[PDB]
Structure formats: structure tokens, C-alpha cells
Design a protein around this ligand. Structure first.
Ligand code: TMP
Ligand code: TMP
Ligand code: FE
Ligand code: FE
Ligand code: FE
Ligand code: FE
Lengths: 193, 193
């Protein structure tokens, strides 16, 4: 059960999350919980760890910049992090909020949440499940999600590569800064395409 | 004159280059020579250094993989370079071939040629002139070159940003590996957009 990992039941967690998140974001997290379960089952990842990480991945999405900065100092994280924003922080720094609020200590779950946006050059299968589940969950409707979903039914590694290439392409299209760890993921996985 | 920098006259250099390069590539280098002169004049960069660097930037474009690998060992360059290819090498490693062939020692010219493909987080105005001149020279006709040319008439920094964003976007679109120094350029310049 979820109580094996955090300090409350699934039902209690959903009540807490309904306070922290706008409706659309909670629905998203519920979608990721479901997609992560399906992917985990397909690719032989612990379905419970996948479901919980999937539900939690965007828990800290609505923390203020101030709170993230406090957490960076508190946990004496990479000071370069202060150069970034919510996009980078909600996973990379938000894991400390999750740990504080829910007493989550499992290193695999924490890591999967940590790099859910940016990935890493090296990702566990659990990491990959969350990263992909986020992108393909049933509530998303971006153009091309059908292709992501087809790829994810066949290959976890290729789904990671596809998502990362699309994100890097989109950020450059938008003229948005790209976190350097994202490029590590990109170059590590792009061959799978 | 060009003999102030290399071991032969412009006319002799063009004869040497006509041997090393296919016609279309030499015409390109001639275009870059001209565009670099115009940009240098506009932005107060030494027009002669700009013209020569512009003419030379793609000198080593047709060296074999073997030759580049030899040069990497010879000059004991970053061993990670062996993971890449001609795209990275012709500037980054090709500068050593240019130095060998032409006795070029000017650090500013060498550097401008060195990073003409990938840029750097920190670029001199000369570096920037070559990087942009390459993209906007009159022979190029890619969709959107008109926008690059308008930008380059107004702002060198914004032209660098525009080109870098477009290249990162294109490489990710293509599913091609992206050299990490390119991302340094991207993140350094993207604000100018
Ligand atoms: C990978 C990456 C994503 N993003 C953005 C794109 C998304 O709009 C936003 C939220 O990402 P997420 O939903 O995958 O957590 O973060 C960056 O700003 N920089 C990056 O390096
Ligand atoms: C910036 C960059 C360009 N390229 C490619 C795009 C171009 O087709 C090719 C030649 O670039 P150049 O004409 O700007 O020297 O190199 C990469 O492969 N990786 C990179 O990181
Ligand atoms: Fe997220
Ligand atoms: Fe999400
Ligand atoms: Fe080149
Ligand atoms: Fe060129």
C-alpha cells in the first residue's frame, strides 16, 4: 500500500493534494498514476512504486519561488539551481517538500520524481516509466501524443528519446532556456530513434 | 594583407582551397568572406581578420575522419572529441590543419574558426561575426534566411541567438546529437531574442 512509503493512505494523500493543486493538475497526476501503472506492468517495473511516483511527480508544482529558494539553501543544493525556475524546481527541488510533507524516503521513487522533467544521462526503468507516463497520460491531447503512445507500447527507451527530442525542439522553437541535464538525457537516448 | 597572417597571398590561398573543396563549398567560403567583411564594418570588428576567418572557416570541411582523429591525438585534444564527427571537427579540430598548412598563429582568427559551428558561452565580436556570416552569406537560401539577415543588420547578439535557437531546434527535429558547447551558446544568448 501507499502507507508502506508515505505517512498516510492514498485517500488521505488525494485530500492533501486537492488543497495544493488546481483541479486540472490533480486530474493530470491521477492520469500519470494510471499511465505509470500500465507502463510498469508492460516493462517489468514495480507497479506500486510506479503508481505512487506517478501520482506524486507534480505534487510541488504550485510552490512559490520563495519556497523553492528556501529549500535550495536548506538542503544546500547546487547553487546554479537559483538561476532557473519552477520548470526545473518542482521535480529537482520539490522532492524535498514531498519528503518533508509525506516522510517519503524510498530512493528509487524520490529519484524518479526528481528527474521527471529533465531526465538524466542514466535513468532507471522506474525513472523512464515516470518520464514517459507524464507525457502520455490520457488527459494530454497535444498534437503527436498518439505517436508517443504508440512508441511507449513498444519501447520505453524509444519513448524517452522521442519525448526528449520533442521537448528540446519545442524549447528551442520557443526561445526558452534549456536545462543542461535535459541535453544529457537527449544525447544519451537520441540513438534509440 | 592576408600575408600578414598566413604564409601565402589571397590568390594563392584560393588556388590551394580550390583543390581541397568542391566548387559549392569554395563559393560558400567566398560568400562568408564577403558577409564577414560587411558585418565587421557594421559592428566595429577588424574587417581584415573577419574576411580571412570568413574565407578560412570551412577550409577543413573535407578532411577524412582518420585525419581528424590523428589531429586529436597529435595535439592531445579533448578525448571526448572522438565521440563526434565532421560537424564538430572541421572547426574545432580543423584549426590545427589550417595552422599546419598556412602557418596561421593569430589567436583571434583561430578561435573564430574554432567555434564557428558550435559557438561558446563567451564569444568575442569577431567570433560572433564569423558565426553569423556563415549563416547569412548570399549563397544560402534556407527558409527564414531573410529573418536572419534582418536581425544581423540590427544586432550581432540577437543574430547569434536566432541562429543558435534555429540550429538546436533543427537538430532536435532531426533526432541528431547536439554538441554540449552548442547548448552553452544557446543558454548564454537566448535572452537576446
Ligand atoms: C526538459 C525541460 C522542460 N521544461 C519545461 C517544459 C514544460 O512546459 C515544463 C513542465 O515540464 P513537465 O510537465 O515535464 O514537468 O517544463 C523546461 O523549461 N526546461 C527543460 O529543460
Ligand atoms: C551547432 C551544431 C551544428 N551541427 C551541424 C549542423 C550543420 O548541418 C553542420 C555544419 O555546420 P556549420 O555549417 O555551421 O559549420 O553541423 C551539429 O551537428 N551539431 C551541433 O552541435
Ligand atoms: Fe512536472
Ligand atoms: Fe506532470
Ligand atoms: Fe562549418
Ligand atoms: Fe560554412
Amino acid at each position: 500500500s501507499y502507507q508502506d512509503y508515505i505517512n498516510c493512505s492514498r485517500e488521505a494523500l488525494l485530500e492533501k493534494m486537492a488543497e495544493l493543486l488546481p483541479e486540472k493538475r490533480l486530474t493530470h497526476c491521477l492520469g500519470v498514476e494510471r499511465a505509470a501503472m500500465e507502463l510498469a506492468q508492460r516493462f517489468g517495473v514495480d507497479v506500486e512504486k510506479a503508481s505512487l511516483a506517478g501520482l506524486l511527480h507534480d505534487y510541488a508544482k504550485k510552490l512559490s519561488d520563495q519556497e523553492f529558494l528556501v529549500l535550495i539553501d536548506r538542503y544546500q543544493l547546487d547553487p546554479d539551481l537559483k538561476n532557473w525556475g519552477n520548470n526545473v524546481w518542482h521535480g529537482m527541488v520539490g522532492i524535498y517538500k514531498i519528503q518533508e510533507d509525506l516522510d517519503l524516503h524510498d530512493s528509487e521513487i524520490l529519484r524518479a520524481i526528481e528527474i521527471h522533467t529533465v531526465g538524466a544521462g542514466q535513468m532507471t526503468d522506474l525513472d523512464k516509466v515516470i518520464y514517459v507516463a507524464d507525457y502520455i497520460e490520457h488527459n494530454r491531447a497535444f498534437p503527436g501524443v498518439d505517436v508517443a503512445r504508440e512508441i511507449a507500447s513498444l519501447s520505453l527507451n524509444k519513448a524517452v528519446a522521442y519525448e526528449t527530442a520533442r521537448t528540446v525542439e519545442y524549447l528551442a522553437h520557443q526561445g526558452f532556456p534549456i536545462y543542461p541535464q535535459t541535453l544529457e538525457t537527449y544525447n544519451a537516448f537520441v540513438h534509440y530513434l
